[PDB]
Amino acid sequence: AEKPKLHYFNARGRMESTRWLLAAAGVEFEEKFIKSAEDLDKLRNDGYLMFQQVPMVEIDGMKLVQTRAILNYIASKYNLYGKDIKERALIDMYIEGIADLGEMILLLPVCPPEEKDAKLALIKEKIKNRYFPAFEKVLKSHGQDYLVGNKLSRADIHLVELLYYVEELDSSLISSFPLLKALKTRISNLPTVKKFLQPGSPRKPPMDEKSLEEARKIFRF
Amino acid sequence: AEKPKLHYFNARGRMESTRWLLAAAGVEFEEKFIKSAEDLDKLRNDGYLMFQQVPMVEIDGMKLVQTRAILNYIASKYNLYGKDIKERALIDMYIEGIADLGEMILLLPVCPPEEKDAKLALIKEKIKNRYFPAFEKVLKSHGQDYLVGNKLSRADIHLVELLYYVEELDSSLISSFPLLKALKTRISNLPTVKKFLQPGSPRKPPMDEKSLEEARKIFRF
Ligand SMILES: COc1ccc(CSC[C@H](NC(=O)CCCN)C(=O)NCC(=O)O)cc1
Ligand SMILES: COc1ccc(CSC[C@H](NC(=O)CCCN)C(=O)NCC(=O)O)cc1
Ligand SMILES: [Cl-]
Ligand SMILES: [Cl-]
């Protein structure tokens, strides 16, 4: 066959959820790091990018852009997208809420500086009052180890990734959600995830000021 | 099975793409209009909104929130999500680019007054240089009447819907893109879509200042 090839810059950004999903599925991948605007232009000029943007993933003869297109494909291929159309609907509903919260956290450092205090507070309010309660409620309702179908799915993976980012933001926020804490523990002990969490995997660190500036350069924003 | 029931306010907003897809599929549906913050609060209190937000669609016993979850389910249910995983990947890539552009357009009236003109100019540059070229290129690649698999899919529907919104912004934007023009025409003449475009359907008008203010009251922004 061949290893999926992930085109992005050397940072979490919009590619990190794909790294998590592939790693969780046990799929070895290669990365080709964009180091400059000229590298990105080369991808564009070569016809690699449908909308002149990355992430792009080379997989199974396709050149897929758009995070959701990439993740949907990987999830379906590796049986992490539930068993039927109704389980998929629960998965999609859950992971779109996850993606909303993740997007708020992702973009926080590019908030206008004058807006940062209020928005961080609103993110924390939403975690405590909206998102964490929603997921805790799902887990409490069925009492099962996984979010959907009593079986590992992408929803468990995407959620637990987000829990690591929320921990980085403020380690107290999960304190009143024992079922989310338990899910974090369980999923982090699955062999593929536990390996990804260990030093040496493709897992990327928090984006520092420098890495963000590098993004600003490469992507012209 | 129940008739799908769409919960939203009486406007396009985030529910319009669902109205388009159900109508195109020939699926009869009902709408219950949120008229006040109090109506929204009742749906929230009563447990029907996973993330305390609408759109919400009651379909097949589910209370589905998140537009992409709703659309993914409807598309699968009505054979508008292609015929295999690789077709779904093209569809997803295409409709995510459509959603990106649609989101820019949706949010224009909520731009700070002094940023709006520049935002519109940027949207127009993206239409002409990024998005319309990408979709024209797809249509020219196979020369067929539909974007994917030589068969109607959700991609054709979401795209043509967007072409109507672009027309409202500036009827000149499509002028250099004859294949998109022709898709607009053909999809608009499909019996179901034709009927949806005619008066007295659930299709919603452009949101005016009065409807935007109602949104501000109901959703408290
Ligand atoms: C907060 O950290 C980051 C770092 C990088 C990015 C940009 S990701 C690269 C970008 N892709 C997209 O915006 C795709 C979104 C599709 N829904 C990109 O390629 N930008 C170049 C461009 O748009 O011209 C965002 C936040
Ligand atoms: C430009 O016109 C509009 C009109 C209404 C809306 C808001 S749609 C209702 C809103 N839902 C969401 O934001 C869902 C997004 C999930 N990806 C909502 O229910 N707001 C209430 C709240 O968030 O508390 C946005 C632009
Ligand atoms: Cl993306
Ligand atoms: Cl939504």
From Swiss-Prot, chains A, B:
Outcome following mutation: residue 8 to F: Decreased isomerase activity
Residues bearing the modification N6-succinyllysine: 3
Cell compartment(s), UniProt: Cytoplasm
Binding positions for glutathione per the UniProt entry: 8, 44, 53-54, 66-67
Claim: Ribosomal protein is one of the keywords in the record: no
Expressing tissues: Liver.
Gene Ontology MF term list: fatty acid binding; glutathione peroxidase activity; glutathione transferase activity; steroid Delta-isomerase activity
Stated regulation of activity: The isomerase activity is inhibited by S-methylglutathione (GSMe).
GO cellular component: cytosol; extracellular exosome
Residues in GST N-terminal domain copies: 2-82
Main location: cytoplasm
Keyword annotations of the record: Acetylation, Cytoplasm, Isomerase, Lipid metabolism, Oxidoreductase, Peroxidase, Transferase
Enzyme Commission no: 2.5.1.18, 1.11.1.-, 5.3.3.-
Superkingdom of origin organism: Eukaryota
Modified residues (N-acetylalanine): 1
Summary of pH dependence: Optimum pH is 8.0 for the isomerization of androst-5-ene-3,17-dione.
CDD domains on file: GST_C_Alpha, GST_N_Alpha
Any GO BP: epithelial cell differentiation
Record Gene3D superfamilies: 1.20.1050.10, Glutaredoxin (3.40.30.10)
Occurrences of domain GST C-terminal (ranges): 84-206
Pfam family, one: GST_N
Record's function text: Glutathione S-transferase that catalyzes the nucleophilic attack of the sulfur atom of glutathione on the electrophilic groups of a wide range of exogenous and endogenous compounds. Involved in the formation of glutathione conjugates of both prostaglandin A2 (PGA2) and prostaglandin J2 (PGJ2). It also catalyzes the isomerization of D5-androstene-3,17-dione (AD) into D4-androstene-3,17-dione and may therefore play an important role in hormone biosynthesis.
Domain statement: The C-terminal domain may form a component of the hydrophobic substrate-binding site, but in contrast appears not to be directly involved in GSH binding and is not absolutely essential for catalytic activity.
PANTHER family: GLUTATHIONE S-TRANSFERASE, GLUTATHIONE S-TRANSFERASE A1
Assembly mode: Homodimer or heterodimer of GSTA1 and GSTA2.
Name this protein carries in UniProt: Glutathione S-transferase A1
Organism: Homo sapiens (Human)
